[PDB]
Every structure is written in structure tokens, then in C-alpha cells.
Amino acid sequence: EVETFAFQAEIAQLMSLIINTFYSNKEIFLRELISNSSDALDKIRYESLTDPSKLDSGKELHINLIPNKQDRTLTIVDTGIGMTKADLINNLGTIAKSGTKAFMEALQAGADISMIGQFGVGFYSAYLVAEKVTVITKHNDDEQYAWESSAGGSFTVRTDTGEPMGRGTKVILHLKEDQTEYLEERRIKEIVKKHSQFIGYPITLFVEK
Numbered sequence: 001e002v003e004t005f006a007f008q009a010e011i012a013q014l015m016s017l018i019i020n021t022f023y024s025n026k027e028i029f030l031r032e033l034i035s036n037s038s039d040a041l042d043k044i045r046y047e048s049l050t051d052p053s054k055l056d057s058g059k060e061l062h063i064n065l066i067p068n069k070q071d072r073t074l075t076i077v078d079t080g081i082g083m084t085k086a087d088l089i090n091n092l093g094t095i096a097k098s099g100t101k102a103f104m105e106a107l108q109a110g111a112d113i114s115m116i117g118q119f120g121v122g123f124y125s126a127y128l129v130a131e132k133v134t135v136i137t138k139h140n141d142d143e144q145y146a147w148e149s150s151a152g153g154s155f156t157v158r159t160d161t162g163e164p165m166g167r168g169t170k171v172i173l174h175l176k177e178d179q180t181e182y183l184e185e186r187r188i189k190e191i192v193k194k195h196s197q198f199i200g201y202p203i204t205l206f207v208e209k
């Protein structure tokens with residue numbers, strides 16, 4: 001049972017600007033998703049300090065980067081706090097509305113596009129490199145869900161029947177044809193070292209066949 005939703009007009013506008021604007025510095029998408037993963041890991045760690053049972057869904061706090069040339073996907077997995085269905089449909093878009101407006105106005109000041117992360121909308125930078133994004137997520141208080149969007153003004157949410165996650169978020173980037181450099185080990189390594197060197201969680205870059 002797949003539910004289809006319209007993006008807010010302001011978010012659809014942000015996604016169109018990300019997709020259509022000429023901007024060569026696309027590698028910043030990985031810094032933003034890793035930063036999002038680190039934030040989600042901070043949240044479940046802090047919650048576990050007053051309720052150790054919050055880690056019954058998984059004690060390990062980590063980030064995995066998994067490229068797959070056969071599927072042309074780059075997957076960013078974290079074991080953070082995850083996302084509820086209300087997060088996917090409503091809450092995150094609500095925050096992203098004001099952040100988008102501030103991001104556009106900041107751009108007219110002296111801000112750079114690479115500062116998208118300071119406005120709570122760094123997630124949408126995934127569309128610098130992906131033609132489709134699939135997000136599998138599991139929050140302790142909700143079921144496992146699959147969010148998916150190829151932009152174009154709409155996204156879908158469904159209950160996920162696949163392998164159970166325990167807890168956390170998996171962002172699957174279905175890469176554009178000309179963006180396969182982000183499946184290369186040496187390229188991902190270079191980006192993590194340049195932009196994510198001091199993340200306080202183990203980042204494991206998986207290698208392929």
C-alpha cells in the first residue's frame with residue numbers, strides 16, 4: 001500500500017533549483033548526509049543516557065558507506081534515532097520550509113550554496129547526484145518505512161517489507177548516469193577526508209566485488 005504525497009511548493013522549488021542550477025561542487029552531498037547521520041546518532045545516544053532500553057534495537061552507533069556499481073547506488077547507513085512516519089510526511093518538511101526561505105535569502109546576502117546544511121535542508125542536496133532517493137528508516141516508536149522520490153513534486157511512503165533495520169536510517173542514492181565517480185573508493189575516501197574528518201562515529205567505507 002503506497003501513499004503518494006505532494007511536496008510543499010517551497011520544497012519542490014528548492015529541489016528544482018538543486019537539480020537545474022549549474023553548480024560543479026556536487027561532492028558536498030556526502031558531507032551533508034554524513035552530518036545528518038551524525039546528528040541522528042547524537043540524538044539516540046543522548047536519549048539512551050536516561051533510558052538505556054532505547055538501545056535495545058541496537059547498541060552500535062556507526063555510519064556505513066556502501067557503493068554498488070551493478071545497481072549504480074551509493075548507500076549511507078546509520079544506526080541513529082531514525083525517523084517516524086510523521087517525520088517523513090510532515091515534521092521534516094515543516095522545518096525545511098523556513099530553512100529553505102532563509103537559505104534563499106542568505107544566498108542573496110553573502111552565503112554560499114555549500115552552506116545549505118546550516119539551514120536544515122542539506123538532505124535535499126542528495127539530488128545533486130541522484131535521480132532517485134530511497135530512504136529506509138526505523139524509529140523506536142514507529143514501524144519501518146520506505147520514503148522515495150524522483151523529485152517532480154511528489155514523494156511516496158510505504159511500510160517496508162524488506163530486511164528489518166533494528167533502528168536508524170538508510171539513504172539509497174540512485175546515481176545519475178554521469179555521477180558514477182561517487183562509487184569509486186578513492187573518490188569517496190577523498191571526500192570523507194576533506195569534509196568529514198572529525199565525525200565522532202566510525203565511518204566504514206565498504207568495498208565492492
Ligand SMILES: Fc1cccc(-n2ccnc2)c1
Binds near residue numbers: 087088092120124147
Ligand atoms: F528522509 C527524509 C525524507 C523527507 C525529508 C527529509 N529531510 C531531512 C532533512 N530535511 C528534510 C528526509
